[PDB]
Enzyme design. Structure first.
Site, PDB file in Angstrom:
ATOM      1  N   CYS A 153       1.504  34.344  29.239  1.00 11.80           N
ATOM      2  CA  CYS A 153       2.619  33.413  29.168  1.00 11.80           C
ATOM      3  C   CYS A 153       3.818  34.055  28.471  1.00 11.80           C
ATOM      4  CB  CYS A 153       2.198  32.135  28.439  1.00 11.80           C
ATOM      5  SG  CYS A 153       3.472  30.851  28.396  1.00 11.80           S
ATOM      6  N   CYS A 203       4.782  32.546  25.008  1.00 14.52           N
ATOM      7  CA  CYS A 203       3.701  32.928  24.108  1.00 14.52           C
ATOM      8  C   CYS A 203       3.848  34.372  23.612  1.00 14.52           C
ATOM      9  CB  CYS A 203       2.370  32.744  24.829  1.00 14.52           C
ATOM     10  SG  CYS A 203       1.887  31.014  25.036  1.00 14.52           S
TER      11      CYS A 203
END
Length: 136
Positions: free
Chosen positions: A50, A53
Site C-alpha cells: 500500500c 502505508c
C-alpha cells in the site's frame, strides 16, 4: 553490548509476539487492553503493498526522532499480523494507534503527512486534552 541500539525515538515494525510483551497481552486480555509500555507508543498498521502505508514509515521515523525520549513509535505488518489487526477491528490498513499512558488508545486511519502526524502525536498523545480532561 547494548549501549546504543536505537529503538527509542524510532519506528520499529514488530510481530504480535513483540506486541504482546511490550505493549499488550491479548492472551490474558482477550477483551481488555493492558498497556505494558513505559513510554507513549504509536503503532502504525501498514501493508507494504500500500502506497500510503509506505509513506508513513519515513514520516514516522522523522517524528519519532523529533519527539525522541518522550515517545516510542512502532509499526506492525498486518499481512502477517492478521489476528492482531483483526482483534482491534483494524481489518487491514492503514491504521495508526496512539497509545497514551493514561486511558485506552485512539486510532487514526490512513497515513497522514508529517504535519497532521505532528498534531496527532504532540497535541493529542502528549497533549491528551481529550483524556480525563474536563477542566481538571
Amino acid at each position: 553490548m547494548s549501549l546504543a541500539t536505537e529503538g527509542n525515538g524510532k519506528v520499529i515494525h514488530l510481530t504480535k509476539a513483540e506486541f504482546l510483551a511490550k505493549v499488550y497481552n491479548f492472551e490474558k486480555n482477550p477483551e481488555e487492553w493492558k498497556y505494558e509500555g513505559d513510554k507513549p507508543a504509536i503503532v502504525d498498521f501498514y501493508a507494504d503493498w500500500c502506497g500510503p502505508c509506505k509513506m508513513v514509515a519515513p514520516i514516522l521515523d522523522e517524528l519519532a526522532k523529533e519527539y525522541d525520549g518522550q515517545i516510542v513509535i512502532y509499526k506492525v505488518d498486518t499481512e502477517k499480523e492478521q489476528e492482531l489487526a483483526g482483534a482491534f477491528g483494524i481489518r487491514s490498513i492503514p491504521s495508526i494507534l496512539f497509545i497514551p499512558m493514561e486511558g485506552k488508545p485512539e486510532m487514526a486511519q490512513g497515513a497522514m503527512p508529517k504535519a497532521s502526524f505532528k498534531k496527532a502525536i504532540d497535541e493529542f498523545l502528549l497533549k491528551k486534552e481529550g483524556h480525563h480532561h474536563h477542566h481538571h
